[PDB]
Design a protein around this ligand. Structure first.
Ligand code: NAP
Ligand code: 2W9
Length: 315
């Protein structure tokens, strides 16, 4: 099956196109190509600074009648500087305006860490520490629930929440809507078994981000581990007559995850979608899981003292 059922009753395509780091001059064509070759889920965020350009592509394909709005699954995320209850709606509305949509299929709290509101996405003190917000995440969640009730979003969820943070949302007094999704980093070097099992056991769908290990991350070092170049993964790919990237995308799919590889290269966008016609064996899956080394692409030193920093806990 190409979609997974969410706890709001909607179906979410298990493959989507990522857009973090997609240059604004290239992302419009990337999204157009993606839709042309079958993608029906785009992962966006205000902090990526390219939602207007993503929106241009979506709008053209809707106008062209290449795809109906009901067939698309568009995801965006509430940035850290908008956790205050009174800022949530405006942040969502700005994203809707940029994407040129009247609703989002899914809106995520991007990180559990709230930051001081202002123009800067990462407000810093004079010593380089991020400046936190005092807004309780449970209050941010209530504000997210209001978006469902106002028709701006069909589903709400969370991202980069650890198990205790997920539990805190699930245990919120007066909880109205459970989170539909937790979007987290996940790949063979950070397999996330514990957190995934917990989320799935609660009916929360997990989306795997950076499934290729984010080789274009700005802080990449030459000596870092590289999934795409791992000869063991290359060997599994060769056995199946697929590329290493295709194996890396298929892997989370077979764990009942959604996966959102990013590309702005038309040939790769197409390659990355050709993952529905082969199966990794259980042995392949266990072998890929065995490569776990708790290696994390996405975490910032500036945030490590924030009270809600998610990655101190084991999971
Ligand atoms: N919620 C969060 O906090 C969070 C954090 C990180 C990421 N995300 C989401 O997850 C998406 C994916 O993660 P990511 O962008 O970090 O990294 P990724 O999808 O793991 O890797 C993207 C990199 O892989 C390259 N690539 C793509 N397909 C390839 C292929 N078939 N062969 C070889 N190279 C290929 C891309 O190059 P080209 O583009 O040049 O083709 C790009 O450099 C993001 O774009 C974003 O939407 C969310
Ligand atoms: O958020 C995205 O989707 C991409 C930008 C990014 C990349 C890496 C890290 C953090 C980030 C935001 C907050 C923290 N933190 O460690 O608490 O890290 C944010």
């Amino acid at each position: 099956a190409s979609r997974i059922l969410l706890n709001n009753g909607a179906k979410m395509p298990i493959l989507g196109l990522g857009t973090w780091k997609s240059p604004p001059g290239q992302v419009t064509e990337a999204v157009k190509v993606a839709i042309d070759v079958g993608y029906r889920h785009i992962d966006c965020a205000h902090v990526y600074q390219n939602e207007n350009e993503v929106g241009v592509a979506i709008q053209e394909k809707l106008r062209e009648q290449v795809v109906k709005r009901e067939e698309l699954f568009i995801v965006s995320k509430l940035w850290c500087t908008y956790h205050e209850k009174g800022l949530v709606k405006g942040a969502c509305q700005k994203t809707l305006s940029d994407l040129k949509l009247d609703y989002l299929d899914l809106y995520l709290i991007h990180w559990p860490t709230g930051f001081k509101p202002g123009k800067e996405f990462f407000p810093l003190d004079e010593s380089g520490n991020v400046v936190p917000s005092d807004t309780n995440i449970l209050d941010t969640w209530a504000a997210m629930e209001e978006l469902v009730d106002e028709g701006l979003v069909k589903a709400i969820g969370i991202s980069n929440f650890n198990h205790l943070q997920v539990e805190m949302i699930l245990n919120k007094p007066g909880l109205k809507y459970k989170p539909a999704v937790n979007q987290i980093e996940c790949h063979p070097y950070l397999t996330q078994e514990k957190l995934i099992q917990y989320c799935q056991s609660k009916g929360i769908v997990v989306t795997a981000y950076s499934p290729l290990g984010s080789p274009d991350r700005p802080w990449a070092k030459p000596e870092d581990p590289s999934l795409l170049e791992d000869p063991r993964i290359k060997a599994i790919a060769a056995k199946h007559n697929k590329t290493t990237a295709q194996v890396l995308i298929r892997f989370p799919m077979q764990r009942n995850l959604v996966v959102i590889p990013k590309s702005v290269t038309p040939e790769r966008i197409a390659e990355n979608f050709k993952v529905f016609d082969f199966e990794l064996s259980s042995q392949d899956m266990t072998t890929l899981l065995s490569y776990n080394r708790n290696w994390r692409v996405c975490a910032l030193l500036s945030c490590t003292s924030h009270k809600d920093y998610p990655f101190h806990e084991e999971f």
